Scaffold this active site. Sequence first.
Site, PDB file in Angstrom:
ATOM      1  N   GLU A 101       0.794  -1.223   0.000  1.00 41.91           N
ATOM      2  CA  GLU A 101       0.000   0.000   0.000  1.00 41.91           C
ATOM      3  C   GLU A 101       0.821   1.264   0.000  1.00 41.91           C
ATOM      4  OE1 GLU A 101      -3.807  -0.305   2.320  1.00 41.91           O
ATOM      5  OE2 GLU A 101      -2.541  -1.577   3.576  1.00 41.91           O
ATOM      6  N   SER A 130      -6.451  -2.100   0.833  1.00 36.11           N
ATOM      7  CA  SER A 130      -6.647  -1.600  -0.505  1.00 36.11           C
ATOM      8  C   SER A 130      -7.101  -2.625  -1.539  1.00 36.11           C
ATOM      9  CB  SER A 130      -5.446  -0.828  -1.012  1.00 36.11           C
ATOM     10  OG  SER A 130      -4.936   0.000   0.022  1.00 36.11           O
ATOM     11  N   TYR A 171      -9.018   3.834  -5.988  1.00 36.08           N
ATOM     12  CA  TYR A 171      -8.153   4.930  -6.363  1.00 36.08           C
ATOM     13  C   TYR A 171      -8.068   5.350  -7.808  1.00 36.08           C
ATOM     14  CZ  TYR A 171      -6.268   2.948  -2.013  1.00 36.08           C
ATOM     15  OH  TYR A 171      -6.158   2.382  -0.775  1.00 36.08           O
ATOM     16  N   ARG A 188     -11.393   4.051  10.674  1.00 34.09           N
ATOM     17  CA  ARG A 188     -12.547   3.844   9.809  1.00 34.09           C
ATOM     18  C   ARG A 188     -12.966   2.385   9.645  1.00 34.09           C
ATOM     19  NH1 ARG A 188     -10.750   4.239   5.259  1.00 34.09           N
ATOM     20  NH2 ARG A 188     -11.874   2.440   4.376  1.00 34.09           N
ATOM     21  N   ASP A 202     -15.367  -0.641   7.877  1.00 33.59           N
ATOM     22  CA  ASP A 202     -16.080  -1.090   6.667  1.00 33.59           C
ATOM     23  C   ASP A 202     -17.169  -2.098   7.109  1.00 33.59           C
ATOM     24  OD1 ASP A 202     -14.170   0.431   5.333  1.00 33.59           O
ATOM     25  OD2 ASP A 202     -12.954  -1.356   4.904  1.00 33.59           O
ATOM     26  N   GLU A 210     -14.020  -5.269   8.359  1.00 33.90           N
ATOM     27  CA  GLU A 210     -12.752  -4.985   9.044  1.00 33.90           C
ATOM     28  C   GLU A 210     -12.668  -3.515   9.465  1.00 33.90           C
ATOM     29  OE1 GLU A 210      -9.604  -3.669   6.999  1.00 33.90           O
ATOM     30  OE2 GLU A 210     -10.551  -2.929   5.202  1.00 33.90           O
ATOM     31  N   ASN A 232      -9.893  -0.145   9.987  1.00 25.31           N
ATOM     32  CA  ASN A 232      -8.637   0.452   9.486  1.00 25.31           C
ATOM     33  C   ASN A 232      -8.172   1.549  10.445  1.00 25.31           C
ATOM     34  OD1 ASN A 232      -8.581  -0.989   6.698  1.00 25.31           O
ATOM     35  ND2 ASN A 232     -10.609   0.076   6.736  1.00 25.31           N
ATOM     36  N   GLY A 240      -6.652   6.023   4.560  1.00 26.36           N
ATOM     37  CA  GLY A 240      -6.044   6.837   3.480  1.00 26.36           C
ATOM     38  C   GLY A 240      -6.586   8.273   3.615  1.00 26.36           C
TER      39      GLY A 240
HETATM   40  N1  LIG Z   1     -18.064 -10.582   2.428  1.00 27.44           N
HETATM   41  C1  LIG Z   1     -17.920  -9.807   1.366  1.00 27.44           C
HETATM   42  N2  LIG Z   1     -18.760  -9.931   0.321  1.00 27.44           N
HETATM   43  C2  LIG Z   1     -18.603  -9.145  -0.749  1.00 27.44           C
HETATM   44  N3  LIG Z   1     -17.681  -8.205  -0.979  1.00 27.44           N
HETATM   45  C3  LIG Z   1     -16.866  -8.103   0.081  1.00 27.44           C
HETATM   46  C4  LIG Z   1     -16.907  -8.842   1.257  1.00 27.44           C
HETATM   47  N4  LIG Z   1     -15.898  -8.457   2.119  1.00 27.44           N
HETATM   48  C5  LIG Z   1     -15.281  -7.511   1.456  1.00 27.44           C
HETATM   49  N5  LIG Z   1     -15.804  -7.250   0.207  1.00 27.44           N
HETATM   50  C6  LIG Z   1     -15.382  -6.228  -0.746  1.00 27.44           C
HETATM   51  O1  LIG Z   1     -13.928  -6.254  -0.673  1.00 27.44           O
HETATM   52  C7  LIG Z   1     -13.407  -4.936  -0.441  1.00 27.44           C
HETATM   53  C8  LIG Z   1     -12.153  -5.162   0.493  1.00 27.44           C
HETATM   54  O2  LIG Z   1     -12.860  -5.337   1.726  1.00 27.44           O
HETATM   55  P1  LIG Z   1     -12.124  -5.342   3.085  1.00 27.44           P
HETATM   56  O3  LIG Z   1     -12.479  -6.633   3.804  1.00 27.44           O
HETATM   57  O4  LIG Z   1     -12.346  -4.159   3.948  1.00 27.44           O
HETATM   58  O5  LIG Z   1     -10.552  -5.405   2.794  1.00 27.44           O
HETATM   59  P2  LIG Z   1      -9.372  -4.419   2.532  1.00 27.44           P
HETATM   60  O6  LIG Z   1      -8.570  -4.179   3.735  1.00 27.44           O
HETATM   61  O7  LIG Z   1      -8.591  -4.850   1.350  1.00 27.44           O
HETATM   62  O8  LIG Z   1     -10.018  -3.128   2.141  1.00 27.44           O
HETATM   63  C9  LIG Z   1     -14.550  -4.278   0.356  1.00 27.44           C
HETATM   64  O9  LIG Z   1     -14.481  -2.870   0.507  1.00 27.44           O
HETATM   65  C10 LIG Z   1     -15.791  -4.815  -0.300  1.00 27.44           C
HETATM   66  O10 LIG Z   1     -16.030  -3.973  -1.424  1.00 27.44           O
HETATM   67  C1  LIG Z   2     -10.452   3.746   0.020  1.00 25.31           C
HETATM   68  C2  LIG Z   2      -9.843   3.821   1.415  1.00 25.31           C
HETATM   69  C3  LIG Z   2      -8.654   3.003   1.551  1.00 25.31           C
HETATM   70  P1  LIG Z   2      -8.072   2.356   2.795  1.00 25.31           P
HETATM   71  O1  LIG Z   2      -8.118   3.217   3.992  1.00 25.31           O
HETATM   72  O2  LIG Z   2      -9.018   1.205   3.333  1.00 25.31           O
HETATM   73  P2  LIG Z   2      -9.219  -0.295   2.902  1.00 25.31           P
HETATM   74  O3  LIG Z   2      -8.280  -1.059   3.859  1.00 25.31           O
HETATM   75  O4  LIG Z   2     -10.584  -0.819   2.743  1.00 25.31           O
HETATM   76  O5  LIG Z   2      -8.583  -0.262   1.476  1.00 25.31           O
HETATM   77  C4  LIG Z   2      -6.635   1.824   2.640  1.00 25.31           C
HETATM   78  C5  LIG Z   2      -5.593   2.934   2.577  1.00 25.31           C
HETATM   79  N1  LIG Z   2      -6.129   0.771   3.517  1.00 25.31           N
HETATM   80  C6  LIG Z   2      -9.549   5.298   1.724  1.00 25.31           C
HETATM   81  O6  LIG Z   2      -8.447   5.780   1.355  1.00 25.31           O
HETATM   82  O7  LIG Z   2     -10.547   5.963   2.079  1.00 25.31           O
HETATM   83 MG   LIG Z   3     -12.070  -1.876   3.211  1.00 27.09          MG
HETATM   84 MG   LIG Z   4      -8.653  -2.667   5.440  1.00 28.49          MG
END
Ligand SMILES: Nc1ncnc2c1ncn2[C@@H]1O[C@H](COP(=O)(O)OP(=O)(O)O)[C@@H](O)[C@H]1O
Ligand SMILES: C[C@@H](C[P@@](=O)(OP(=O)(O)O)[C@@H](C)N)C(=O)O
Ligand SMILES: [Mg+2]
Ligand SMILES: [Mg+2]
Length: 306
Positions: free
Chosen positions: A15, A150, A216, A255, A257, A270, A272, A276
């Site tokens: 990242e 990301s 992004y 933040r 999700d 998860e 964060n 970002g």
């Molecule tokens: N259970 C799920 N079903 C469908 N899409 C998902 C699911 N979990 C995550 N995603 C999609 O994958 C993206 C990455 O999710 P996330 O688990 O927060 O990981 P990362 O840290 O890479 O952002 C999410 O923002 C969402 O759009």
């Molecule tokens: C889109 C999001 C990214 P990010 O904070 O979160 P994710 O882990 O879902 O990518 C990432 C930097 N790790 C942000 O910049 O607002």
């Molecule tokens: Mg996410």
């Molecule tokens: Mg994350």
Amino acid sequence: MTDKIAVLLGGTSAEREVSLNSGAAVLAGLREGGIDAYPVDPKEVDVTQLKSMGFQKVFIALHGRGGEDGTLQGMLELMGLPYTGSGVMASALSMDKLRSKLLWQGAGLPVAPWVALTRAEFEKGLSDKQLAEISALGLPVIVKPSREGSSVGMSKVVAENALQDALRLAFQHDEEVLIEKWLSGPEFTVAILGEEILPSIRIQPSGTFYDYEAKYLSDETQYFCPAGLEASQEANLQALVLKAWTTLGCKGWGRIDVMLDSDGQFYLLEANTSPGMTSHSLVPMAARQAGMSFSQLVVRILELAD
Ligand SMILES: Nc1ncnc2c1ncn2[C@@H]1O[C@H](COP(=O)(O)OP(=O)(O)O)[C@@H](O)[C@H]1O
Ligand SMILES: C[C@@H](C[P@@](=O)(OP(=O)(O)O)[C@@H](C)N)C(=O)O
Ligand SMILES: [Mg+2]
Ligand SMILES: [Mg+2]
């Protein structure tokens, strides 16, 4: 002055370029709010000499392993320098999507049905009586590395026939993998600042999932602030995100999700602890909507440094 602040950008994670981007923004934001901030890429300067360089405080604009896990935070605690987000434990806890899910579930929070796989389990050929497990989940399922951000290493799998490849990919990133059930609904994020929680955001990627490119480098993904949610739901969220936040023991800023599922419930993906702050980031989007300016935000975040 004296109160020379260090803005930890770059680093060496996957990242890394987002970080450089997040870091460039926090820099100007801070300087705009009248602070003496300096760019410090750990992939050059040795962060260990941080104290020996006269920085009174530190703003962490690093993402992933090396900056969002307990490591950096551990060192700083020992150097006696204030830094922006969560503590050792909550940064360690959050990075691990696997231990996060178990802890949240241990506390009764709504986390999606999943299966964890280690790489060695994968190298040996996983039990035919293991796809029994992944299958009891649904079609489709999503594959994600345990400690990434990301949308790196993630892949959606429809039918058990594409999983071997999904997993090959996810493993190139981490030795621990989660295989989880596809949530079929809108996606959401919630920013936290101090004890305040910012107006919710609803994301609408122009693709399959909110992928690195949607995140992004795509001007098609859509954002709604607030979420466009009935006041019933908009309260279930905040309360959930807040329960979630305290369970992790996170502080300062971060933040979360979340996503809706067919049964109409909110599922926690998860957390964060070092979000970002690029021209596409969510934290800054949620903040504006709450009448702050990019410098006020960041400045407020620094005010919270401990
Ligand atoms: N259970 C799920 N079903 C469908 N899409 C998902 C699911 N979990 C995550 N995603 C999609 O994958 C993206 C990455 O999710 P996330 O688990 O927060 O990981 P990362 O840290 O890479 O952002 C999410 O923002 C969402 O759009
Ligand atoms: C889109 C999001 C990214 P990010 O904070 O979160 P994710 O882990 O879902 O990518 C990432 C930097 N790790 C942000 O910049 O607002
Ligand atoms: Mg996410
Ligand atoms: Mg994350």
